[PDB]
Amino acid sequence: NDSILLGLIGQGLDLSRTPAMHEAEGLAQGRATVYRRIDTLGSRASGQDLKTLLDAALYLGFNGLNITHPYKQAVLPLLDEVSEQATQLGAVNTVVIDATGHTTGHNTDVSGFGRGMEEGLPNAKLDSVVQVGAGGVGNAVAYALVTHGVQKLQVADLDTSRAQALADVINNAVGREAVVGVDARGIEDVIAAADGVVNATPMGMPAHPGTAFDVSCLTKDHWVGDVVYMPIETELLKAARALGCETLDGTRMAIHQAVDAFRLFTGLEPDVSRMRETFLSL
Amino acid sequence: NDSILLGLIGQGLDLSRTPAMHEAEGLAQGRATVYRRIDTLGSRASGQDLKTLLDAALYLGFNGLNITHPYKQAVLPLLDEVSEQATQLGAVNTVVIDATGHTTGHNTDVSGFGRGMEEGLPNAKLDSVVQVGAGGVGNAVAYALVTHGVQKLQVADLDTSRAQALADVINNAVGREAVVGVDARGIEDVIAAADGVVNATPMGMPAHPGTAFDVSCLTKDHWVGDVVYMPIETELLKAARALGCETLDGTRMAIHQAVDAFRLFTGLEPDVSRMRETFLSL
Ligand SMILES: NC(=O)c1ccc[n+]([C@@H]2O[C@H](COP(=O)([O-])OP(=O)(O)OC[C@H]3O[C@@H](n4cnc5c(N)ncnc54)[C@H](O)[C@@H]3O)[C@@H](O)[C@H]2O)c1
Ligand SMILES: NC(=O)c1ccc[n+]([C@@H]2O[C@H](COP(=O)([O-])OP(=O)(O)OC[C@H]3O[C@@H](n4cnc5c(N)ncnc54)[C@H](O)[C@@H]3O)[C@@H](O)[C@H]2O)c1
Ligand SMILES: O=C(O)[C@]1(O)C[C@@H](O)[C@@H](O)[C@H](O)C1
Ligand SMILES: O=C(O)[C@]1(O)C[C@@H](O)[C@@H](O)[C@H](O)C1
């Protein structure tokens, strides 16, 4: 029943649901678990370099870390080993620390989004998909999409260069032209012709109300996904559901990234329903 | 029910019972608790400076640390505040870390030994006591003795200068000549005339079998204490008990230092019997 020590290195972490998910699941499996925010905007860790914080976790007996913005790319060269997916994406969100201090990076944003597709869109047609948004989250989402059956992914971002950089990284990772950058302007016509669309922008959040594109381009035959998890039913997903579309809400990725990280950190098989219930309770 | 994160910085920590005591008591009070060894002889922390390790604990959300050999003196100048007792002794074994990272040093070896006297020797005559051993543990024990009613303490060590240094520190701390260094050679005659004697040497441990002085100097009217806690009944305490002496075993200090540290770390009132039972179970 050895206790488990985890943390999350990033900025602006107060509202994260990840600590609670891991603390509750460890306890449910008979292992007292501490999961600390390590917030470089906060009083404890501000001003410290990522390496200092990583090294600190090694010295003081952490079993694992998650890594979030702005450190998911910066962390790679600091680690002893990086999984093939995280290496090719160039982004790590999960660091397993061995008993004796060795670090291995993984990306459970990718695996978590993919699991969400399996769990919540098992029958979705995947030939042609549009993703709007090529930021940090979007990079993992795109990789997940094209490794879980999407034949052609068109990625749009207001910053065309972000979309093109994403496409290059993912296509190299998978070894085919799976992703094409397309203009954000006129994206509705591209979506109208596709099988599905995923929002990977902040649109739909309380501080970013609305949608990333005009929802009148949707049809009843589309499926629609959203990375936003608060609210769970974004304006986009409401519009999709009104037409009878299958929808994939952002909680699936948010929960499954933690399920998969917990498994990697501990070697235990997480109970998905318990972790989901923790997430929804917050 | 916020989780609690603690650790112990020192060398050669595998057999410490302190982590288990704190982990169990936190859990018993409804707070998942991790207490990590931070062992500078081990794979995680070896080669690191004390300041690096202290700073690490601040950054990564520790609520407290214990400090053991060889760092109890070295830690003082690294802390924001130090209690008056720990300051005057020049040794800290407990560091409370505030929510926002401020450190306060305390010495619960002193308070713990004193509590052990109250708990286990409530009726002991304290006019004249001999202590054999003026190492690290001995410094706290001597301070506890003379602040919990001992009028004259004679301290002997094979290294006379250690005993004399101890006497100077304690006498300055209390503001009277409470302690006198005396020769180890011939200590039996000094003990014979005293009310009680405390072993603060390694003698009695499995790897240091025997006693620090010839037990034929004891009488039925003496009380006898020992800092050794494994075995609980040292050869010294066996000899004392055979005469009908009251005895103070080393587990009292070992438990109470943790009781008092837990209170300081958490603001919760520890259950002494639960912590004692954890200690004895290991
Ligand atoms: N479900 C989860 O597990 C999870 C985890 C973290 C974040 N998120 C969500 O993901 C969202 C995106 O996070 P991020 O870190 O990638 O943000 P980001 O700001 O780094 O990237 C968002 C991208 O969207 C683009 N964009 C904004 N409006 C657009 C529009 N109308 N058309 C095309 N592109 C547009 C921006 O140019 C930017 O590159 C967050 O706001 C958050 O709501 C979800
Ligand atoms: N009960 C507790 O909470 C607790 C905690 C830690 C250690 N301990 C015990 O305390 C013991 C002492 O620890 P320490 O760190 O002070 O050790 P230390 O080696 O630093 O000090 C022991 C001192 O005893 C002296 N000594 C040895 N034999 C002697 C003798 N025959 N006569 C006079 N002096 C003699 C040595 O010269 C030395 O200065 C440990 O061996 C351990 O068993 C108890
Ligand atoms: O829940 C969060 O705050 C996270 O930062 C979200 C996402 O970035 C994950 O990859 C991290 O493991 C946890
Ligand atoms: O139990 C231990 O290992 C300790 O190191 C014993 C003693 O040195 C105490 O002061 C520490 O708090 C804990």
Instruction: Return binding residues of A for shikimate.
Output: 16, 68, 72, 93, 109, 257
Q: Do residues A69 and A13 share a domain?
A: yes
Q: Which two tokens stand for residue B239?
A: 């000899």
C-beta of residue B137 within 8 angstroms of C-beta of residue B109: yes
CB contact under 8 A, B62 and A59: no
Instruction: Return binding residues of B for L-quinate.
Output: 16-18, 68, 72, 93, 109, 257
Q: Is the link from the previous residue into B70 a cis peptide, with omega within 30 of 0? A: yes
Indicate whether residue A66 lines ligand 3 (CB < 6 A). Answer: yes
Residue given tokens 């979309």 in the structure block: A163
For residue B14, the enclosing domain spans 1-106+250-282
Q: Which two tokens stand for residue B265?
A: 């770390």
C-alpha dist (Å) from residue B189 to B154, B214, B248: 12, 10, 21
Q: Do residues B173 and B226 share a domain?
A: yes
Q: Do residues B153 and B142 share a domain?
A: yes
CATH code of the domain in which B42 resides: 3.40.50.10860
- A193 by Cβ neighbours in 10 Å (0-12 / 13-18 / 19+) ranks as exposed
Q: Which two tokens stand for residue A103?
A: 């670090």
- Ligand 4: nearest atom to the Cα of B137: 8
Handedness of CA B108, B114, B117, B122 (dihedral sign): negative
C-alpha–C-alpha distance, residues B232 and B205, integer Å: 9
Q: Do residues A139 and A91 share a domain?
A: no
Nearest CA-CA partner of B162 in B170, B152, B172, B174: B170
C-alpha–C-alpha distance, residues B4 and B208, integer Å: 37
Cβ-nearest to A60 among B26, B38, B99: B38
Strands B179-181 and B223-226: unpaired
C-alpha–C-alpha distance, residues B80 and A75, integer Å: 32
CATH code of the domain in which B207 resides: 3.40.50.720
C-alpha dist (Å) from residue B123 to A165, B115, B248: 80, 13, 12
Handedness of CA B55, B57, B60, B64 (dihedral sign): negative
Q: Do residues A155 and A231 share a domain?
A: yes
Q: Do residues B150 and B84 share a domain?
A: no
Q: How far from each other are the two terminal CA atoms of chain B, in whole angstroms?
A: 27
Q: Do residues B245 and B255 share a domain?
A: no
Number of domains in chain A: 2
Q: Do residues B163 and B82 share a domain?
A: no
Q: Do residues B12 and B58 share a domain?
A: yes
Q: Do residues B91 and B208 share a domain?
A: no
Q: Where are the beta strands (DSSP E) in B57-187?
A: 64-67, 81-82, 94-97, 103-106, 128-132, 152-156, 179-181
The 3-class secondary structure across chain A, one letter per residue, is CCCEEEEEEECCCCCCCHHHHHHHHHHHCCCCEEEEEEECCCCCCCCCCHHHHHHHHHHCCCCEEEECCCCCCCCHHHCCEECHHHHHHCCCCEEEECCCCCEEEECHHHHHHHHHHHHHCCCCCCCEEEEECCCHHHHHHHHHHHHCCCCEEEEECCCHHHHHHHHHHHHHHHCCCCEEECCCCCHHHHHHHCCEEEECCCECECCCCCCCCCHHHCCCCCEEEECCCCCCCCHHHHHHHHHCCEEECCHHHHHHHHHHHHHHHHCCCCCHHHHHHHHHHC
Closest residue CA from atom 2 of ligand 3: A16
Nearest CA-CA partner of B227 in B205, B202, B253, B250: B250
CB contact under 8 A, B3 and A56: no
Q: Which two tokens stand for residue A138?
A: 């979007």
CB contact under 8 A, B53 and A60: yes
User: Sheet of B81-82: strands edge to edge?
Assistant: B33-39, B4-10, B64-67, B94-97, B103-106, B81-82
Q: Do residues A42 and A85 share a domain?
A: yes
C-beta of residue A67 within 8 angstroms of C-beta of residue A8: yes
Resolution in A: 1.2
* Chain B contacts to A (CB-CB under 8 A): 3-5, 7, 23, 26-27, 32-38, 43-45, 48, 52-53, 55-62, 99-101
User: Sheet of A4-10: strands edge to edge?
Assistant: A33-39, A4-10, A64-67, A94-97, A103-106, A81-82
Contacts of A26 in chain B (CB under 8 A): 32
C-beta of residue B190 within 8 angstroms of C-beta of residue B166: no
- Method of structure determination: X-ray
Q: Of the residues B69, B162, B201, which should be mutated to test ligand 2's pocket, given the most ligand atoms within 8 Å of the CB? A: B201
C-beta of residue A34 within 8 angstroms of C-beta of residue B4: yes
SS3 B85: helix
Q: Do residues B68 and B189 share a domain?
A: no
Nearest CA-CA partner of A17 in A259, A236, A198, A263: A259
